[PDB]
Write a protein that binds this ligand. Structure first.
Ligand SMILES: CC(=O)N[C@@H]1[C@@H](O)[C@H](O[C@@H]2O[C@H](CO)[C@H](O)[C@H](O)[C@H]2O)[C@@H](CO)O[C@H]1O
Ligand SMILES: O=c1ccn([C@@H]2O[C@H](COP(=O)(O)OP(=O)(O)O)[C@@H](O)[C@H]2O)c(=O)[nH]1
Ligand SMILES: [Mn+2]
Length: 287
């Protein structure tokens, strides 16, 4: 029976938000005791999954760097399975993996609009969870491919439902959050509501929770299509609506998904993951 106090110490980072009003911890560098967690999870012999999509030129531009960095930094010391979804398997970079890492690749259909490529991930992830992921891992993370692991991204991030604080808005007020503001959309969040602005580049939890996260998000995506509307920030707008209704049991600080374009302020102690510079002119084929 793992207890929050066993591994989480908010007092180590007094200058930032370390606890939500619903008692969920916000994991910042310095507040976690990975050694305690590694031993605890090793004894339970857990396996962690990681899904990543790479469709079109996202493959040549980001897949190798992502996987290479994941192999080295993701859940080191524990069995891990990388689930790679690509539209063209012949372009799969196939790198050498280290101890406790293995993978499996799936060929998927490339949607015509990049917006749909991004949103369809929700439907696809759920299908795979039902078909096999639920039987293969204890925890699963779903990530964007356009980023790179920079340091240990370990078990301190595991939980029932895990959300990521977006690097640009972690200190902003709810009314400045770029939530979908049109009531016609299923992702609508009225001003005066909201806890944080979560980044869709990273989210996870147990297979059961992620299944519900992805299922609900895609239901909203399909609903909007029937009402001839598309969320301003697509799947991210829907993810934020979901996490508003179903609070995450754990939140990761921006240190786990940092945009170096902002620079490196005092609150960012040790970057575990960083954004890749945007290259839409090459990787995207439509507006
Ligand atoms: C203050 C400000 O406008 N900052 C923006 C960032 O928000 C922006 O990042 C994008 O943010 C949206 C949600 O608003 C979504 O998370 C996108 O995936 C993310 O890239 C950034 C562009 O990289 O520019 C800043 O100026
Ligand atoms: O043409 C596309 C559009 C999106 N994606 C995937 O969907 C994620 C979301 O897209 P993107 O990174 O372009 O979103 P941004 O973070 O820049 O908003 C990407 O990381 C990829 O994993 C992809 O493979 N091909
Ligand atoms: Mn991205």
């Amino acid at each position: 029976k793992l207890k929050l106090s066993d591994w989480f110490n908010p007092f180590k980072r007094p200058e930032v938000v370390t606890m939500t009003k619903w008692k969920a911890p916000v994991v910042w560098e310095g507040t976690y005791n990975r050694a305690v967690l590694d031993n605890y999870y090793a004894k339970q012999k857990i396996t962690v999954g990681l899904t990543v999509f790479a469709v079109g030129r996202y493959i040549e531009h980001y897949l190798e760097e992502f996987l290479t960095s994941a192999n080295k930094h993701f859940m080191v010391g524990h069995p891990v399975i990388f689930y790679i979804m690509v539209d063209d398997v012949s372009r799969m970079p196939l790198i050498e993996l280290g101890p406790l890492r293995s993978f499996k690749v799936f060929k998927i259909k490339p949607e015509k609009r990049w917006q749909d490529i991004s949103m369809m991930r929700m439907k696809t992830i759920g299908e795979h969870i039902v078909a096999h992921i639920q039987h293969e891992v204890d925890f699963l993370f779903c990530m964007d491919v356009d980023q790179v692991f920079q340091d240990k991204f370990g078990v301190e991030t595991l939980g029932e439902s895990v959300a990521q604080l977006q690097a640009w808005w972690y200190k902003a007020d709810p009314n400045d959050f770029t939530y979908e503001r049109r009531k016609e959309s299923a992702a609508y969040i009225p001003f005066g509501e909201g806890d944080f602005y979560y980044h869709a580049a990273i989210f996870g939890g147990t297979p059961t929770q992620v299944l519900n996260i992805t299922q609900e998000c895609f239901k909203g995506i399909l609903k909007d299509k029937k009402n001839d509307i598309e969320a301003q920030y697509h799947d991210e707008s829907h993810l934020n609506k979901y996490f508003l209704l179903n609070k995450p049991t754990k939140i990761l600080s921006p240190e786990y998904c940092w945009d170096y374009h902002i620079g490196l302020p005092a609150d960012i102690k040790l970057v575990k993951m960083s954004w890749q510079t945007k290259e839409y002119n090459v990787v995207r084929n439509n507006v």
